[PDB]
Symmetry: C3
Subunit: 260 residues, 3 copies
């Protein structure tokens, strides 16, 4: 029975963990201010939709990272027989506790933020509703199944079956980004900025399942602290700079996206 | 350790607490039967959409209040060091239990009912998709971060940080109600009814973050039973009477709200 | 003190229970491959929306059934006084545990998939946004209040009160399916197929609250393993075959539903 307080103190006293988390909370807040200021000029409703959708990314990120830092969305789980992190221990409170400190809260960051990124990119590319619906539903399925994998402690094999379903959903999102929206952006007159954001999104997103497989959730070659910093670095690019690049464009081309 | 039945019994056997819960269950139930009856004559689809979104308010309310009354959405939390309610006891059942009875279920009632209130009001004001999206998203963020605040026990200051984040989201919603949709109602031809509903909402909505701060979750000047009734009083106005007013107007201005 | 592993193992070792779960994981997966293959030639965006909504049904189902088989969305609950399943035991890990193995994960399978079934049927019927919004919101309310009913252990009466609220939400869905969309399909040119799929849906959907009342969650004439197969059988028809029938039509009549999103 680990308390939220003990997990909160655990993040603290842990150099890599505390920094990877609190640094994103600060970068998330600064992004919001920068983005709100960068977009005060917008007037086109559609251009503003792309703007707000994008601003929600760091908004979800600051709130979600606070969920982790606070200890609210953190748990200690025991990995099943065969798992490379099975048998691990953690010092919480005044005793050694079996298990791994699991930052499941990240999956909430992803479930709520990724759809916004997709909504922004889809609108930017001039996507019809079918593709937006397809990309977003499967993106959500990808995040939720990823969370289920991280939460499964009954069977090592089951954790990886979850991982495989999540990857299949990932592929659907990738196909829309790489093939469908790439084409739609041409008709939208945003093919250039879309290619840039598209490349950045694909490379960064491909990084998450890699970190998962290598971190404590996977084969654990990366300690709980390094797994967290890997994710945090990826978020900075996939979220904060991605958002800046998109907004930097929008604010100079409000006329191009001003449609229906 | 505390069972659901023990919380269910705690609510009963306590006139204040129970009355603030079972009364809203009955009032909600009656409001549904009344709202459905009231709108049975509607024929326009857009008008019908506003009525259903409004009818969902008391639907979500009766379900959520049942969640609280049954003990399903209630928990016992120990406040952090420095919290005005630290070191409290409850006596769940017949044993003295440390902590405070936390009715976190109210937040779900809010995260699900407020978007419906906003959707109805936005449509009534002739709002475009951009503003509805902005209003609803930040509103949900408001409710979720508010829930996170109540559920945080690791730090006293963390709770207020959540509270601060939620207030920021609250201001975004308020701005759209007061400034944005105020102008939209004009062109939509519902400027006069929106005024009454706008005021009512902004005044009633301001009561929640105030009650929070004064109740057990906040500085704790109001006992658990008084906070409950404070919220229930607010729910009765911001939901039932507010919904009756909106519906009464809608049924009288179906033609106007339909557009063409 | 019941762990996810103990529940995972309880399912395994229980022939009825393991089969009701793993068979659907397999049929859901085969359904997805079959459905993606069937709809490969679609081009119209409205036709494709109907296809994706339908395909999402077995996608949700495979994930959620894995949730159940893994033990992630299963818990042990003790029924309230007067409940026909009160005082039951389950034997987990090694000792006897009071309560009933509660597969609440099924409600998540429902709350996420039923909306897709409705979206697909609504579009097939040429429904306007109002009825679609009304059908989907009350359907979700139906699934959520149902989950609350199963999760309620404090009062036997409260359990059935949640059940009644859920039924009322169900009546809204049924009304839209039987009265509203039945007429819209005529104007959409999809009466024949819609009426068929609507009827198949209504009959199967009616099966769920009946199983709930007869199963371990209700009067318990059906033990845990049997209530599970009752639900798994309903799912096979209401999801996999229903979706297969709907896609069979879609892929031979793209032009009829082509219209515009
Ligand atoms: C639990 C309980 C009562 C539950 C009542 C319910 C669930 C009734 C819902 C009715 C609806 C949604 C009616 C729809 C109409 C529109 C119909 C449509 C668009 C579908 O054609 C309209 C004009 C808005 O009244 C009581 C205690
Ligand atoms: C786990 C597992 C299987 C998972 C399978 C997945 C996730 C497949 C998804 C396919 C999609 C979404 C196809 C979309 C097309 C439309 C898309 C578009 C035109 C936009 O590319 C269309 C015409 C409907 O097939 C098996 C065991
Ligand atoms: C309109 C829906 C409102 C639901 C009202 C439910 C109230 C039922 C209370 O029942 C009683 O609860 C006590 C405490 O658990 C038991 O000791 C007692 O034996 C049982 O009879
Ligand atoms: C389609 C989804 C595929 C998942 C199939 C899950 C079945 C794997 C069961 O594994 C076995 O479970 C036993 C009891 O827990 C262990 O004693 C044993 O060592 C382990 O190997
Ligand atoms: C068409 C659906 C009909 C639903 C009928 C539900 C009735 C369930 C009543 O339960 C009983 O209520 C008593 C008084 O509250 C408790 O003392 C007792 O312990 C409890 O078991
Ligand atoms: C649609 C399905 C119909 C729901 C039927 C549920 C009613 C359950 C009745 O149970 C009985 O209630 C008595 C109190 O009233 C208890 O004294 C008795 O021990 C208990 O067995
Ligand atoms: C702000 C967060 C972003 C952009 C997150 C992106 C996350 C993914 C692309 C995650 C994908 C995963 C899989 C495909 C497999 C299983 C594990 C996950 C959840 C890490
Ligand atoms: C039916 C329910 C209604 C109209 C609820 C409204 C709720 C609010 C305006 C809540 C606001 C809050 C904050 C601004 C700060 C933190 C705590 C909350 C959640 C009480
Ligand atoms: C894929 C799943 C399907 C088609 C599920 C359908 C479920 C229902 C129609 C459930 C209805 C219920 C009630 C009306 C009352 C309370 C209990 C439920 C949840 C079983």
């Amino acid at each position: 029975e680990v308390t939220q307080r003990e997990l909160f103190e655990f993040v603290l006293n842990d150099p890599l963990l505390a920094s990877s988390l609190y640094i994103n909370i600060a970068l998330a807040g600064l992004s919001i201010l920068l983005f709100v200021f960068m977009t005060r000029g917008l007037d086109d409703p559609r251009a503003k939709l792309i703007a707000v959708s994008t601003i929600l990314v760091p908004v979800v990120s600051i709130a979600s990272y606070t969920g982790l830092a606070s200890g609210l969305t953190i748990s200690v789980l025991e990995m099943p027989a065969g798992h490379f992190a099975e048998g691990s221990s953690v010092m919480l409170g005044g005793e050694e506790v079996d298990g791994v400190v699991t930052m499941w809260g990240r999956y909430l960051t992803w479930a709520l933020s990724t759809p916004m990124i997709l909504l922004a990119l889809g609108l930017l590319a001039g996507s019809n509703a079918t593709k937006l619906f397809t990309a977003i539903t499967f993106d959500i399925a990808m995040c939720v199944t990823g969370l289920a994998a991280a939460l499964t402690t009954s069977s090592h094999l089951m954790r990886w079956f979850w991982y495989a379903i999540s990857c299949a959903c990932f592929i659907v999102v990738l196909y829309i980004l790489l093939v469908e929206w790439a084409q739609d952006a041409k008709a939208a007159g945003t093919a250039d900025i879309f290619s840039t954001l598209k490349l950045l999104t694909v490379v960064m997103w491909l990084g998450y399942p890699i970190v998962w497989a290598l971190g404590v959730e996977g084969v654990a070659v990366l300690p709980v602290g390094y797994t967290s910093w890997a994710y945090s670095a990826l978020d900075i690019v996939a979220k904060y700079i991605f958002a800046f690049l998109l907004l930097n464009y929008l604010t100079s081309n409000e006329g191009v996206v001003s449609g229906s």
